[PDB]
Amino acid sequence: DTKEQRILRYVQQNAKPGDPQSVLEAIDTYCTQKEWAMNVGDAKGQIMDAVIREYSPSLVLELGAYCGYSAVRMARLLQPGARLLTMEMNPDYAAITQQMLNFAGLQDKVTILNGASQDLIPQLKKKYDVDTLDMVFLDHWKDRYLPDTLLLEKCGLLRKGTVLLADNVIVPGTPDFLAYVRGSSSFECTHYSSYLEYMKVVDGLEKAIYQGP
Ligand SMILES: O=C(CCN1CCN(c2cccc(C(F)(F)F)c2)CC1)c1cc(O)c(O)c([N+](=O)[O-])c1
Numbered sequence: 001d002t003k004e005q006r007i008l009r010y011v012q013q014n015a016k017p018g019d020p021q022s023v024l025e026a027i028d029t030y031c032t033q034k035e036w037a038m039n040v041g042d043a044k045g046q047i048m049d050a051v052i053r054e055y056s057p058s059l060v061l062e063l064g065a066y067c068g069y070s071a072v073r074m075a076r077l078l079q080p081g082a083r084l085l086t087m088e089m090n091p092d093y094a095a096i097t098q099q100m101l102n103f104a105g106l107q108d109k110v111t112i113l114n115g116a117s118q119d120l121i122p123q124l125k126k127k128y129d130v131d132t133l134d135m136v137f138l139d140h141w142k143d144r145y146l147p148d149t150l151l152l153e154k155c156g157l158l159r160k161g162t163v164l165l166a167d168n169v170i171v172p173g174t175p176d177f178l179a180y181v182r183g184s185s186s187f188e189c190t191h192y193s194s195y196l197e198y199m200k201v202v203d204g205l206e207k208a209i210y211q212g213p
């Protein structure tokens with residue numbers, strides 16, 4: 001079997017069904033004591049929680065689901081009627097994420113889009129009845145952060161006030177994206193210093209609020 005399968009099994013045998021909180025703790029425990037995995041983690045996760053609470057978004061778009069850690073993290077805090085759409089190109093990971101959401105009992109709030117962000121973003125308004133996004137969580141391959149941000153803007157998916165939250169702006173780093181948003185008058189950026197998931201290495205999240213053209 002695979003690492004992702006082992007994590008899922010760990011959650012089923014250790015977490016409490018329908019309890020998003022126990023699911024998160026089960027995953028963090030497994031990754032802290034058995035195998036490192038690219039989940040955003042609890043340190044950065046707590047910062048995410050605080051940002052979600054402040055903005056209370058109704059429509060959130062996540063780029064990069066993996067095993068569903070951050071999706072469960074964000075969805076558990078969404079207000080009734082809110083929706084979370086998450087894109088995952090690896091069909092194997094998308095399957096795990098779906099199972100993770102089901103076990104957490106958050107399957108009704110989340111919709112998994114299986115495909116590459118560059119191919120799916122142009123189809124959001126048409127196929128998923130999306131006007132504009134309240135918040136976007138960037139956490140897929142780092143070289144896609146800038147091009148996908150430009151794609152979201154081109155397709156008119158961003159509006160004044162849309163919050164973009166990006167992971168790993170320090171480690172592994174996202175050079176072009178970070179330079180672009182911090183230098184553009186279209187974005188108001190704030191940096192939250194934290195730590196790389198399951199490690200003492202310093203990393204951080206960048207919050208970039210779209211101001212419009
Ligand atoms: O950190 C990485 C990748 C970087 N990598 C260096 C090695 N390191 C690690 C493990 C055990 C042990 C040791 C060592 F033995 F060196 F100590 C090192 C694991 C991590 C990372 C993090 C993310 O949040 C992402 O979204 C993301 N994406 O999307 O690609 C990538």
Ligand SMILES: C[S@@+](CC[C@H](N)C(=O)[O-])C[C@H]1O[C@@H](n2cnc3c(N)ncnc32)[C@H](O)[C@@H]1O
Pocket residue numbers: 038039040041063064065066067068069070071087088089090093115116117118139140141144
């Ligand atoms: C770090 S993992 C996401 C982990 C998740 N954010 C969490 O906090 O647990 C990044 C995911 O990006 C996804 N992937 C990479 N590039 C993608 C793209 N352009 N569109 C969709 N999925 C992509 C990968 O398949 C990978 O599972």
Ligand SMILES: [Mg+2]
Pocket residue numbers: 038039040139167168
């Ligand atoms: Mg990450």
